[PDB]
Amino acid sequence: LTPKVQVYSRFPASAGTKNVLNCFAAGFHPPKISITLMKDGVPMEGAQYSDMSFNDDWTFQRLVHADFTPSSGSTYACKVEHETLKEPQVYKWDPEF
Amino acid sequence: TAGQSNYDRL
Amino acid sequence: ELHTLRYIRTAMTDPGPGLPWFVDVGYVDGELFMHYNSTARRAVPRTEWIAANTDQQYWDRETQIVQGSEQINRENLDILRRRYNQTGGSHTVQWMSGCDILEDGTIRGYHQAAYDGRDFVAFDKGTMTLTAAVPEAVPTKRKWEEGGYAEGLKQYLEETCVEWLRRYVEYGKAELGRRERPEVRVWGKEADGILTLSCRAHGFYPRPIVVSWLKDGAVRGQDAQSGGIVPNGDGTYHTWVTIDAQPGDGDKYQCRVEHASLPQPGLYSWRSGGGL
């Protein structure tokens, strides 16, 4: 099963203020998934895994969150690697969208 | 609360 | 008055790198309170209300039974691979047990398993027998009919978990009953002559939310596309709803957010702008 990924922030994005970058993937199988948060293509520091659950329809879910400060010019994205995707699916994070 | 470990045996 | 309890278990062959192969997670009304992993091998609390109302004797007793469940699910991966005739690779054993206390007071207890993300065995209370969904789940039914776990499991799903769930609701009545107001932001993006209006609600509690887009005061549910109620790292929730519009019509649109924290449904615009 292919994962349904959505990239979002904890608090509304504001320059020069601390925030949390969340990357949630759901509706996938097998449970093995490589979710990585990255700043300008380079992986982010303090990436923590807290979610390891499955829905009522047995489909797995995972949330990867890391502490960051949004800056203008730096592009934030989430790279998802799965054995059912073939090519890695990357989802861009927009502060004003 | 979770019961006995025997209920998970297949 | 609908209160739920769920204990989800996962036994893995390929976790893979660094990750634990076994994981036991507990829930009270969809909120995490019980945590266990094959690396640490300890059942630890996650919420402040559960730890303040339980002693270490409870957690020590909860650890050993899940440690036994870990060893039982360890051999389950090997037993099920023989029935299917598999050498190895990506294989998983799922388990979801618990009970639901409905508004009326009717007890709804469930106990079911799955192999490779597909229904394996499910326990029925009305028949008092373990139902086999796959032909490879038939030798499991033979073990259950010989051992007679059916009566012991029924007195657990109808009494043991139900009596404890009533206490769990009372222990975290202040936590579950608390309402968290969301931070709403209305955005817009221009692509190929189509203005995509976005609406994001930040950190709200409880989980149920209805975020709909409006055009000239009238709801447009069909044209709007939702991303679902996605969870945050602190326990709160997030939602993302987008709608397609004509360039120069952005301010005619309004984001309607109806939540338990708001006594009246919140109406937010792009130029207003949003929650602030």
Residue numbers in the entry:
A (entry chain B): 2 to 98
B (entry chain C): 1 to 10
C (entry chain A): 1 to 276
What are the paper's exact sentences on this?
Highly polymorphic class I molecules encoded by the major histocompatibility complex (MHC) are crucial in the adaptive immune response to viruses and some intracellular bacteria, binding peptides inside the cell and presenting them on the cell surface to CD8 T lymphocytes. In contrast, chicken TAP genes are highly polymorphic, with each haplotype encoding a TAP molecule with a peptide-translocation specificity matching the peptide-binding specificity of the dominantly expressed class I molecule encoded by the BF2 gene, with the BF1 gene expressed poorly or not at all. In this paper, we find that two other haplotypes known to confer resistance to Marek's disease also have low cell surface expression and promiscuous peptide motifs, and examine the structural basis for promiscuous binding in three low expressing molecules. Second, we show that peptide-binding repertoire and level of cell surface expression are inversely correlated in both chickens and humans, indicating that this relationship is a fundamental property of class I molecules.
Crystal structures, based on heavy chain and β2-microglobulin (β2m) expressed in bacteria and refolded with synthetic peptides, showed that BF2*2101 remodels the binding site to accommodate two peptides with completely different sequences, including the anchor residues. Small residues bordering the groove lead to a large cavity in the middle of the groove, within which Asp24 and Arg9 can move, creating different configurations, as illustrated for the 11mer peptide GHAEEYGAETL and the 10mer peptide REVDEQLLSV. In BF2*2101, small residues like Gly68(human position 69), Ser69(70), Ser97(99), and Gly152(155) create a big cavity in the centre of the binding groove, allowing Asp24 and Arg9 to move. However, the two structures with the 10mers TAGQEDYDRL and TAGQSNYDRL display a completely different mode of binding, for which the P2 Ala does not interact with the MHC molecule at all (and therefore is not an anchor residue), with Arg9 interacting as a bridge between Asp24 and Pc-2 Asp. A further mode of binding is shown by the 10mer YELDEKFDRL, for which both anchor residues at positions P2 and Pc-2 are acidic. In this structure, the P2 Glu interacts with both Asp24 and Arg9, and Pc-2 Asp interacts with Arg9. These various modes of binding are presumably just a few out of many and illustrate the promiscuous binding of BF2*2101, unlike anything seen for mammalian class I molecules. In this article, we confirm and extend the finding that BF2*2101 binds 10mer and 11mer peptides with three anchor positions, with many different amino acids with different chemical characteristics, mostly charged and polar at positions P2 and Pc-2 (and hydrophobic at Pc), which is unlike any mammalian molecule described thus far. The structural analysis of BF2*2101 showed that this low expressing class I molecule achieves promiscuous binding by remodelling the peptide binding site in a way never described for a mammalian class I molecule.
